[PDB]
Amino acid sequence: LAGIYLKVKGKTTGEIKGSHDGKIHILAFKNDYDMPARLQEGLTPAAAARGTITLTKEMDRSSPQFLQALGKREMMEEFEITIYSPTELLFTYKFEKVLITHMDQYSPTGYIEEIKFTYSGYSLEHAESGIAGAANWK
Amino acid sequence: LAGIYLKVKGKTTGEIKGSHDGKIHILAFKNDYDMPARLQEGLTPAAAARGTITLTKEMDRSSPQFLQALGKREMMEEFEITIYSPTELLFTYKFEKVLITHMDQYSPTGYIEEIKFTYSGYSLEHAESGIAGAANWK
Amino acid sequence: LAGIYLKVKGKTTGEIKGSHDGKIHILAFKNDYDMPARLQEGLTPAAAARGTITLTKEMDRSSPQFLQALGKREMMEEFEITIYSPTELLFTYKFEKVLITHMDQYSPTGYIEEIKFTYSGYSLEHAESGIAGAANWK
Amino acid sequence: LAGIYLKVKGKTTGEIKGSHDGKIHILAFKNDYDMPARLQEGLTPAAAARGTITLTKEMDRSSPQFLQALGKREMMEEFEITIYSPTELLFTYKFEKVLITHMDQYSPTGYIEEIKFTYSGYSLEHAESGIAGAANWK
Amino acid sequence: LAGIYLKVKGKTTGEIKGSHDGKIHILAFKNDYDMPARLQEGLTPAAAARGTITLTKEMDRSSPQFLQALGKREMMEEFEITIYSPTELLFTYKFEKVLITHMDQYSPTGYIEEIKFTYSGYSLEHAESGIAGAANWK
Amino acid sequence: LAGIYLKVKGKTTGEIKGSHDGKIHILAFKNDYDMPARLQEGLTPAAAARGTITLTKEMDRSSPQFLQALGKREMMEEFEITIYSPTELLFTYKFEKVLITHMDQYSPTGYIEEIKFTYSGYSLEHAESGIAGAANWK
């Protein structure tokens, strides 16, 4: 089925699922990555950069798991986003050193949450072509 | 009946009710929880974090009670939110060390108030599944 | 008649009226009260808090009186808001140490003003039930 | 005729008129007056306060006169706003120590300008009733 | 023909034209002029003030010329805006010591640019009446 | 075909293409260039200035390549934007010392990304006329 799916396992919680077997349906995503134009003398690109990905999802059985990880600073052991479109896989993201840094959960005004994850290493792969990019990986 | 309900008791005021017996009908909620990506050396997660929950409700007989607690820094002894949806219980939140930190009460432009509560320990439980998360609890 | 009414007397000006006899019809109100989560060591709640109430009203014969009080830092000797709804009294607010801190008066774009009052002590009373709250009073 | 009119004379320019004889038709006004809740020890109310009135008007023959006064810091010798409504005079404002502090002139997106005036002394008078207020006057 | 026209010559580039012969059709303008209420002791009005005029225009053959002047800090030798309305000349602006300080060029979302010019001396003249104002001129 | 096209090669990645042969179709662009009015004593125009161009595009096979370059601070060896309109070439931009400084990639709320590039030298050329501008080039 078409759309955005997350495959995630916490370092202490283990596999986090919703109700693409084992994957959580994501309603929307925004990957935001910032690099200053001027690199501080002697500073690594990675330390200068800020990568965050915000996932919007229906509140579900994973919602307690994410909420706990946030407060306990639990790292995600596995974090992979796969995007399907008309049928076929389009994009695969993978992220390393993933920490949850913000959650908002809210009612209608169904129940929705926005979860923001900060990461270090990343990978994006265009499936049809096989072109991939990665930085700060392993 | 479907929707968001609060069960609350003040440490000095005692049980706070409106007109789900003993529970206050809440129109909307937003649970906002922030964790810095970089943890200050020697700082607890809890001290780095900020958890707030904002409740929107019709002004009612509890409105004076909340307004007083706010000005007197009265802690909530009990603070539990239960969310029902089509029929059935979906989610239970519990919060510890609950202090009211902001209120806005206002006319049409019926009478509505937004109440913001800061907390320390929290719990969220997905009812159907029993999956729960908690941090900084007791 | 239904709506929001103010009963106000200045310490030097005396009773301030418009054209609920002696009360000023208010179009809208917003009571905003802020309490920091962390209380500075040795600081009173009252000094940490900020209470303001903003009243929206048609410009009228009281408009010069409020405008003068603002510039002269005249305290309100009496300041009571009463809210009526369908018929019956709903809520009574009373405020102490009331100073006007901001006015905006403006044309259509009838003549309207927004008046912001800062206070110390406050009271809110739910009429039907008699439940009341107050802080920093007398 | 109904609406907002300005009567103004510059200290060096003399009488400033448009095409209520001698008065400039104003499209809109906003009188904004701010008083800090806490008065700095030994500070006059007037020095703590900020009064500004913003007038919106069609660009006209007075537009060069206001634009020049702004750049030359020319004080207004006379500055009176009169407001007429259905027929009859409603309100009279008078301002002292009037300096122009901001102009924006702009095309359709007819030709319009917003002019912001800072003042010290002020007066507002409700015509029908004769109730007046003033502060920091002469 | 009605509207806003610019006559401009760069100090090094010479005359800058588009496709009112020799004048560039401007879609919109905003002249923004700021004067602080308090003049720093010993500071000229001109140094305290900030005058900027923002011109919105279709991208055209002048677009490279303005873009270059911006990066090279080239002063405009001539800068005159004339505004025609129903037929007849309404207003003439002239500006001295004109430097381009910001450009945004952008696609539909035809090709449009917003160009912001900072100036020192200025003049505005109401044509029908001949009333003029100027400050900081020559 | 009409619209905005990018021709780009990374210094390490080589040619970056999508699915105007070899050019990437761009949905929208915004070239933003800022020059302070006051040039710091002894500072070059280039160091005072900030030039950025933001490109909006469908996520595609180039998306991994741009995302990697961003994190690795890879400079673009070639960066040329060409704009076609009704049929014919309108504008050519060229940029030097191009670094990617920000990306946002996001879902519908197809898959879209906004990519912000900072540059030093630039050129813009109006094709029909041949008028060109450039600063800080080679």
Author numbering:
A (entry chain A), B (entry chain A), C (entry chain A), D (entry chain A), E (entry chain A), F (entry chain A): 2 to 20, 26 to 92, 103 to 125, 140 to 168
Quote the passages of the study that discuss this structure, keeping the authors' original sentences.
Hemolysin co-regulated protein 1 (Hcp1) is a component of the cluster 1 Type VI secretion system (T6SS1) that plays a key role during the intracellular lifecycle of Burkholderia pseudomallei. Hemolysin co-regulated protein 1 (Hcp1), encoded by bpss1498 (BPS_RS26895), is a component of T6SS1 and forms the secretion tube of this system that is necessary for the transport of effectors from the bacterial cytoplasm into host cells. One critical virulence factor expressed by B. pseudomallei is the cluster 1 Type VI secretion system (T6SS1) that has been shown to influence the intracellular behavior of this pathogen and be required for multinucleated giant cell (MNGC) formation. Hcp1 is recognized as a promising target antigen for developing melioidosis diagnostics and vaccines.
While the gene encoding Hcp1 is retained across B. pseudomallei strains, variants of hcp1 have recently been identified. The prevalence of hcp1 variants was assessed in 1,283 primary clinical B. pseudomallei isolates from 9 hospitals in Northeast Thailand, and in addition to wild-type Hcp1 (Hcp1wt), two variants designated variant A (Hcp1variant A) and variant B (Hcp1variant B) were identified. Sequence analysis of 1,283 primary clinical isolates of B. pseudomallei demonstrated the presence of 8 hcp1 alleles encoding three types of Hcp1 proteins, including Hcp1wt (98.05%), Hcp1variant A (1.87%) and Hcp1variant B (0.08%). Since Hcp1 is known to play a role in cell-to-cell spread in cell culture, the efficiency of multinucleated giant cell (MNGC) formation was determined using B. pseudomallei strains expressing the three different Hcp1 types. For control purposes, B. pseudomallei K96243 containing hcp1wt, hcp1variant A or hcp1variant B were constructed for use in these assays. Interestingly, when Hcp1variant A was expressed in B. pseudomallei K96243, this strain retained the ability to stimulate MNGC formation in A549 cells. In contrast, however, similar experiments with the Hcp1variant B demonstrated a decreased ability of B. pseudomallei to stimulate MNGC formation. Collectively, these results show that B. pseudomallei strains expressing variants of Hcp1 elicit variable antibody responses in melioidosis patients and differ in their ability to promote MNGC formation in cell culture.
